[PDB]
Design a protein around this ligand. Structure first.
Ligand SMILES: *[C@@H]1O[C@H](CO)[C@@H](O)[C@H](O)[C@H]1NC(C)=O
Ligand SMILES: *[C@@H]1O[C@H](CO)[C@@H](O)[C@H](O)[C@H]1NC(C)=O
Ligand SMILES: *[C@@H]1O[C@H](CO)[C@@H](O)[C@H](O)[C@H]1NC(C)=O
Ligand SMILES: *[C@@H]1O[C@H](CO)[C@@H](O)[C@H](O)[C@H]1NC(C)=O
Ligand SMILES: *[C@@H]1O[C@H](CO)[C@@H](O)[C@H](O)[C@H]1NC(C)=O
Ligand SMILES: *[C@@H]1O[C@H](CO)[C@@H](O)[C@H](O)[C@H]1NC(C)=O
Ligand SMILES: *[C@@H]1O[C@H](CO)[C@@H](O)[C@H](O)[C@H]1NC(C)=O
Ligand SMILES: *[C@@H]1O[C@H](CO)[C@@H](O)[C@H](O)[C@H]1NC(C)=O
Ligand SMILES: *[C@@H]1O[C@H](CO)[C@@H](O)[C@H](O)[C@H]1NC(C)=O
Ligand SMILES: *[C@@H]1O[C@H](CO)[C@@H](O)[C@H](O)[C@H]1NC(C)=O
Ligand SMILES: *[C@@H]1O[C@H](CO)[C@@H](O)[C@H](O)[C@H]1NC(C)=O
Ligand SMILES: *[C@@H]1O[C@H](CO)[C@@H](O)[C@H](O)[C@H]1NC(C)=O
Ligand SMILES: *[C@H]1O[C@H](CO)[C@@H](O)[C@H](O)[C@H]1NC(C)=O
Ligand SMILES: *[C@H]1O[C@H](CO)[C@@H](O)[C@H](O)[C@H]1NC(C)=O
Lengths: 181, 214, 306, 229
C-alpha cells in the first residue's frame, strides 16, 4: 500500500506499474470509487473527479506498462487513497498533501518567537523538524515555534514532514533584525 | 530533387510596361508553387502562393498563373517599386524538400548610356603599406555588360583584379563598374604605364584611360 | 444449431484481438500520416518521441465488409439468442463457416454501421457494477446520421429522443428501476473520446456530441429543432487509436466529403458516484476500438478441431 | 500579424557551430510552422528546413541533413537554427521565415510550404579570417583626366573583416551623387569596397571631402580627408 506526500500547490505523481510492458486498460479512482482518469486504449479518459482539470497521466509511459496519475496544484483535500484498477489489480496508493506556512512576515525582530503552521488532512499526524541555517533541529508535531529567534537563525530553514517512512521538504526564509549591535 | 529553373535570368523592361517571368520545374509540383520578390538587402516578399493566389496585401498588377511544371508571374503595368529579383518556391513534394528557383532580376531598361572611366592611382600612403590598389571606376552606364581589361605596360595580363557593379540606381537607373588591379609594392614599381580598357555597349569604341607612375 | 452447450466470453474473445490487429494493418496501407509521433522510453523516465515521415496520399478510405472464416483444424461457433449477455453458457450455439459481413468502422461514442439487435435494445458490460467498464449498447433500430466535411452531422431529434428512452429504460432495467437515468457529455479526456470522432472519406471527423448526451429523465429538447445538428470538425493532427502517439494527415481536398451511417449502437460509461442516491449518470465512452469489434463478435468464438 | 526578430550576425570559424535565434511575436506561436532560408552573397535562396512547431518535428534539406537542426522554444516563443561543421560556403544571410497553419492548437493544420512572414535576416560569416578594422585610402580626384563640369573621386576601404560597412561623405552631408560599390572578398579572406562621388572640380580646395566609413564589428570609425591631391 504505497504512500506519497506532496506540498500544497505542487505536482505529485501517483505511480501505478503493470506486470508486463504493454499499454493495457487501467483506471484511477479515489476511496469513493469516483473515476479520476483512465485510458481507452490509446486515448485518455478523465472522469467526474474534482481533480479533472488537474489530473493527467503520461501516455508515453503507457507502453512501458506504466500508467501514473499526475496531480498538479496539489491541495490538502487532494489527500486520499487513490486506487488504480489495472488488470484486475487494485494498487491502492495513499496521498498526503501538507502545507507549511509561517505566520508573521518573513521579516521578524530579534528574540521574538517564530511560529510555523502545518496544514494537514484529517486523520493525519505528521512529525515536523525544521533545520536552521546554523543547526536548530527544533521539533514540532503539527505546529512548530522557535522559543527565542536568535540572530543566527535568520536564514533558510530546512523543514521536514515525516509520515509513514516518507517525508517532504519545506524550505522557509527567516530574517532576524536588530539595530546594529 | 526538383530542379526549379527560372529561364529569364534577367529581364530588362521599362516602368508601366508589362513584365513576364517563367519558372520551369522538373517533375510536376502541382499547384504548390509560390513567388517571391526580394529587394537588395531585404528579406524576400511573399508575392504569390499556391501558384495563382496573391498574398494578403499585395498589388493586383502581379498575376500568378500556371500548374504542373509551368508557372508564370505576369505583371501588368510594372511599377517603380516593382524592381527586384523574383524567386519561385516549390513546396509540393513530401517529406519536406522544398527548393527555390535560381532567380530573375527585373531591372529597368533605359537608354544605352556610355561609361565615363575614372582611373585612380594608388595613394602613396597605401603604397607605404606594402601593396598598391588602382581603381578604374565606370560611372553611370547601361546596360550592365561592360568588359574591362587591365593592361600593365601594354600587357593583356588578366588576373589580380576584381570588379564590382552596383545595383540599378534610383534616379539615373544606371550601373557603375569598379575594377581594381591590386599589385604589390615591388611589382607596382616595376611597371611604368597602367591602363584600363573599357569595352562597353554604349561606347562607340574602346576607351583606355591610364596613368604613369608619378 | 449445434446440439451442445459451450462457454462464450466476448470480453475475452480472441477474435476481437485478431480483427483489431487486422484493422490496424488495414490502416497502415490505406491511411498513412505525413508524420507519426510515438513514445520511446527505456524506462529511465526520459522519453524521446520516435518520428516517422512518409508520403501522405489523399485516398478516400472507404471501409469494405470483412468476413472471418476458420481455416483448417479450426471452427467458428456462433451463439443464437434474442438477448445474449455474450459472457456465459450459450444453449443455441451453432458452428458457422464465416461470420457475417462486418464493416470495420473505427469510431468513438457511436457505433456506426454495425449490426442491429434483433429483438430489443440490448446492453452488454463485462461488469455493470464496475463504473470503469464500458457499457456497449446495441440498438434494435438504427438512427441514420449524416455527416459532411462542410462541418456537421444531422441526426433525427425524434429518433434520437426515442433511442435515449429505449436505452434509458434498459439501463435502469439493470441498475434498478427505482433509479433516475441521466445522460451527460464526456467527462473529459482526449478530443477523440470527448466527442464522437470517426473517419469519413479519410477525413478524421470530430463531432461535438453534447446535444446527443444531455438527456434528463424529465424535460425534452425539441423547441424549434426538427433535426439535431452536431458541430463537427475535421482535424489534421490527431491522437492515434492504433497506438499511443499523434499523427498528422494532409488537409482535405475533395470538393466534398459526405457520410450517411447508421447509428447501430453506442458505447456508454456510467459514473460510480460512490453508491449515491438513485441518479446514475451515463456519458459517452469508447476509444478502445476493440469494444467496437466486440460489439460485432459478441456472439462468436473460434475453436480448434476435435 | 507576427513579427520575427533574429539573433545578431555571428562570425564563426571553419568547422564550428552557429546558432541563430528567431523571436516570434504578434500571434499564436504554435499556429505557425517556421522555416529557415539561407542566402549566400550574390547567391539565391536555399531552403534549409522547416519546423512544424506544434508537433516539434522538423525536416531538413538533403545537402544539410546531419549538420543542421531546427528547434523551437514554445515557452519563450523562439525558433533556433543550428549549423555544425561550418564551412566558408555556409557564409550567408540566414533568414527566418514563417507561415500561419490554422488552428493547430485545435488539430487543424494546413502544413504550408510557402513562407508569409520573414525575419530581418541574420548574417553568418564563416572564415579563417580575424576581425580587423578597415583602412580608408583617398582616390585623388581626376584633375588631369576629367574637367569642364565635374570630377569624380572617392575612398577605398581596403582589407576589412567582416561585414558589413556603412559609408557617407562630408560627415554624412554629400550623400548625393555617390556610388558605394559592394564589398569584394579578396583571396586573403578580407573584403574591400570603394565609395565614390562625382562632384564639380570648381569645388576642389574649399570643400574638404571626407568619406565617413564605419565598421561596428571591429568598432573602428575612420575619417580620411580626400584632398584634391
Ligand atoms: C533519446 O532516445 C534515444 C532512443 O532512440 C536514446 O538512446 C537517447 O538516450 C535519448 N536521448 C537523446 C539522445 O535525446
Ligand atoms: C447473463 O447476464 C447476467 C446479468 O448480468 C450475468 O450475471 C450472467 O453472468 C450472464 N450470463 C449468464 C451466466 O447467464
Ligand atoms: C426494439 O426495437 C423495436 C422495433 O424494432 C421496438 O418496437 C422496441 O420498443 C425496441 N425495444 C426497446 C424499447 O429496447
Ligand atoms: C464486478 O465489479 C465490481 C465493482 O463494481 C467488483 O468489485 C467485482 O469484483 C466485479 N466482479 C468480478 C468478480 O469480476
Ligand atoms: C441522410 O442522407 C440520406 C440519403 O443518403 C437521406 O435520405 C436522409 O434524410 C439524410 N439524413 C438526414 C440528414 O436526416
Ligand atoms: C425502490 O426499491 C424497491 C424496489 O426494489 C421498492 O419496493 C421501493 O418502493 C423503491 N424505493 C425507492 C428507492 O424509491
Ligand atoms: C460543444 O462541445 C464543447 C466541448 O467539446 C462544449 O463546451 C460546448 O458547449 C458544446 N456546444 C454545443 C454545440 O452544445
Ligand atoms: C437537462 O436539464 C438541464 C437542467 O434541468 C438543462 O439545462 C439541459 O438543457 C437539459 N438537457 C437538454 C438540452 O435536454
Ligand atoms: C418535437 O419536435 C419534433 C421534430 O424535431 C416533432 O416531430 C414533434 O412533434 C415535436 N413535439 C411535439 C409533439 O410538439
Ligand atoms: C444504413 O444507412 C443508410 C443511409 O443512412 C440507409 O439508407 C439504410 O437503410 C441503413 N441500413 C440499415 C442498417 O437499416
Ligand atoms: C457506413 O458507415 C460509414 C462510416 O465510416 C459511412 O462512411 C458509409 O457511407 C456507411 N455506408 C454507406 C451507406 O455508404
Ligand atoms: C439524493 O440527492 C442528494 C445528492 O447530492 C443527496 O444529498 C440526498 O441525500 C439524496 N436524497 C435527496 C434529498 O434527494
Ligand atoms: C439436441 O437434442 C438432442 C436430443 O437427442 C440432445 O441430446 C441435445 O442435448 C440437444 N442439444 C441442445 C441444443 O442442447
Ligand atoms: C434454439 O433452440 C431452442 C430450443 O429448441 C429454440 O427454443 C430456439 O427457438 C432456437 N433459436 C433459434 C431461432 O435458432
Amino acid at each position: 500500500k504505497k504512500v506519497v506526500l506532496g506540498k500544497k500547490g505542487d505536482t505529485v505523481e501517483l505511480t501505478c506499474t503493470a506486470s508486463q510492458k504493454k499499454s493495457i486498460q487501467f483506471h484511477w479512482k479515489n476511496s469513493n470509487q469516483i473515476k479520476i482518469l483512465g485510458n481507452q486504449g490509446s486515448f485518455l479518459t478523465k472522469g467526474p473527479s474534482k481533480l479533472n482539470d488537474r489530473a493527467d497521466s503520461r501516455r508515453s509511459l503507457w507502453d512501458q506498462g506504466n500508467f501514473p496519475l499526475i496531480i498538479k496544484n496539489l491541495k490538502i483535500e487532494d489527500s486520499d487513497t487513490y486506487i488504480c484498477e489495472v488488470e484486475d489489480q487494485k494498487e491502492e496508493v495513499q496521498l498526503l498533501v501538507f502545507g507549511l506556512t509561517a505566520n508573521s512576515d518573513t521579516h521578524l525582530l530579534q528574540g521574538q518567537s517564530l511560529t510555523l503552521t502545518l496544514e494537514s488532512p484529517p486523520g493525519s499526524s505528521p512529525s515536523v523538524q525544521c533545520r536552521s541555517p546554523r543547526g536548530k533541529n527544533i521539533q514540532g508535531g503539527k505546529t512548530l515555534s522557535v522559543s527565542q529567534l536568535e540572530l543566527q537563525d535568520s536564514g533558510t530553514w530546512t523543514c521536514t514532514v515525516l509520515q509513514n517512512q516518507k517525508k517532504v521538504e519545506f524550505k522557509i526564509d527567516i530574517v532576524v533584525l536588530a539595530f546594529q549591535k | 530533387e526538383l530542379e526549379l529553373t527560372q529561364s529569364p535570368a534577367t529581364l530588362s523592361v521599362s516602368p508601366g510596361e508589362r513584365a513576364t517571368l517563367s519558372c520551369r520545374a522538373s517533375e510536376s509540383v502541382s499547384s504548390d508553387l509560390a513567388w517571391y520578390q526580394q529587394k537588395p538587402g531585404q528579406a524576400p516578399r511573399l508575392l504569390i502562393y499556391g501558384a495563382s493566389t496573391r498574398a494578403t496585401g499585395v498589388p493586383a498588377r502581379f498575376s500568378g498563373s500556371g500548374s504542373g511544371a509551368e508557372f508564370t508571374l505576369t505583371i501588368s503595368s510594372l511599377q517603380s517599386e516593382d524592381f527586384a529579383v523574383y524567386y519561385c518556391q516549390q513546396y509540393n513534394n513530401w517529406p519536406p524538400r522544398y527548393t527555390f528557383g535560381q532567380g530573375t532580376r527585373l531591372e529597368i531598361k533605359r537608354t544605352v548610356a556610355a561609361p565615363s572611366v575614372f582611373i585612380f592611382p594608388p595613394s602613396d600612403e597605401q603604397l607605404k603599406s606594402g601593396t598598391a590598389s588602382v581603381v578604374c571606376l565606370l560611372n553611370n552606364f547601361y546596360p550592365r555588360e561592360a568588359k574591362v581589361q587591365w593592361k600593365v605596360d601594354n600587357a593583356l595580363q588578366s588576373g589580380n583584379s576584381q570588379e564590382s557593379v552596383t545595383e540599378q540606381k534610383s534616379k539615373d537607373s544606371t550601373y557603375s563598374l569598379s575594377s581594381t588591379l591590386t599589385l604589390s609594392k615591388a611589382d607596382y614599381e616595376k611597371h611604368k604605364v597602367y591602363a584600363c580598357e573599357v569595352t562597353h555597349q554604349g561606347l562607340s569604341s574602346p576607351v583606355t584611360k591610364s596613368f604613369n607612375r608619378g | 444449431l449445434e446440439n451442445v452447450t459451450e462457454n462464450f466470453n466476448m470480453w475475452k474473445n480472441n477474435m476481437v484481438e485478431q480483427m483489431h490487429e487486422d484493422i490496424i494493418s488495414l490502416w497502415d496501407q490505406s491511411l498513412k500520416p505525413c508524420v507519426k509521433l510515438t513514445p520511446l522510453c527505456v524506462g529511465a523516465g526520459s522519453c524521446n518521441t520516435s518520428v516517422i515521415t512518409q508520403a501522405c496520399p489523399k485516398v478516400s478510405f472507404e471501409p469494405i465488409p470483412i468476413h472471418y472464416c476458420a481455416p483448417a483444424g479450426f471452427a467458428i461457433l456462433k451463439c443464437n439468442d434474442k438477448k445474449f449477455n455474450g459472457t456465459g453458457p450459450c444453449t443455441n450455439v451453432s458452428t458457422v463457416q464465416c461470420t457475417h459481413g462486418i464493416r470495420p468502422v473505427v469510431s468513438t461514442q457511436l457505433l456506426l454501421n454495425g449490426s442491429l439487435a434483433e429483438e430489443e435494445i440490448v446492453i452488454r458490460s463485462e461488469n455493470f457494477t464496475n463504473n470503469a467498464k464500458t457499457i456497449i449498447v446495441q440498438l434494435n433500430e438504427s438512427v441514420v446520421i449524416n455527416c459532411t466535411g462542410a462541418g456537421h452531422c444531422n441526426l433525427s431529434k425524434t429518433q434520437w429522443e426515442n433511442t435515449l428512452e429505449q436505452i434509458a429504460i434498459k439501463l435502469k432495467e439493470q441498475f434498478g428501476n427505482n433509479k433516475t437515468i441521466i445522460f451527460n457529455p464526456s467527462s473529459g479526456g482526449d478530443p477523440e473520446i470527448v466527442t464522437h470522432s470517426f473517419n469519413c472519406g479519410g477525413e478524421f471527423f470530430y463531432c461535438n456530441s453534447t446535444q446527443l448526451f444531455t438527456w434528463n429523465d424529465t424535460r425534452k429538447l425539441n423547441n424549434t429543432g426538427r433535426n439535431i445538428t452536431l458541430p463537427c470538425r475535421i482535424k489534421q493532427i490527431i491522437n492515434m487509436w492504433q497506438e499511443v502517439g499523434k499523427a498528422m494527415y494532409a488537409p482535405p481536398i475533395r470538393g466534398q466529403i459526405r457520410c450517411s451511417s447508421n447509428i447501430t449502437g453506442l458505447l456508454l460509461t456510467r459514473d460510480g458516484g460512490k453508491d449515491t442516491n438513485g441518479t446514475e449518470i451515463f456519458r459517452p465512452g469508447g476509444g478502445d476500438m476493440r469494444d467496437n469489434w466486440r460489439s460485432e463478435l459478441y456472439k462468436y468464438k473460434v475453436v480448434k478441431i476435435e | 500579424q507576427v513579427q520575427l526578430l533574429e539573433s545578431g550576425a555571428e562570425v564563426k570559424k571553419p568547422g564550428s557551430s552557429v546558432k541563430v535565434s528567431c523571436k516570434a511575436s504578434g500571434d499564436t506561436f504554435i499556429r505557425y510552422s517556421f522555416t529557415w532560408v539561407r542566402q549566400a552573397p550574390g547567391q539565391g535562396l536555399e531552403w534549409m528546413g522547416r519546423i512544424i512547431t506544434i508537433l516539434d518535428v522538423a525536416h531538413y534539406a538533403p545537402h544539410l541533413q546531419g549538420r543542421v537542426t531546427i528547434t523551437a522554444d514554445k515557452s519563450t516563443s523562439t525558433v533556433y537554427l543550428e549549423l555544425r561543421n561550418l564551412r566558408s560556403d555556409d557564409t550567408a544571410v540566414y533568414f527566418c521565415a514563417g507561415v500561419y497553419e490554422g488552428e493547430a492548437d485545435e488539430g487543424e493544420y494546413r502544413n504550408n510550404g510557402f513562407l508569409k512572414h520573414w525575419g530581418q535576416g541574420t548574417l553568418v560569416t564563416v572564415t579563417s579570417a580575424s576581425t580587423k578594422g578597415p583602412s580608408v585610402f583617398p582616390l585623388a580626384p581626376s584633375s588631369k583626366s576629367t574637367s569642364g563640369g565635374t570630377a569624380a573621386l572617392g575612398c577605398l576601404v581596403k582589407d576589412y573583416f567582416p561585414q558589413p560597412v556603412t559609408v557617407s561623405w562630408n560627415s554624412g552631408a554629400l550623400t548625393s551623387g555617390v556610388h558605394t560599390f559592394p564589398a569584394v572578398l579578396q583571396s586573403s579572406g578580407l573584403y574591400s569596397l570603394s565609395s565614390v562621388v562625382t562632384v564639380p572640380s570648381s569645388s576642389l580646395g574649399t570643400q574638404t571631402y571626407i568619406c565617413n566609413v564605419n565598421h561596428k564589428p571591429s568598432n573602428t570609425k575612420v575619417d580620411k580627408k580626400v584632398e584634391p591631391k
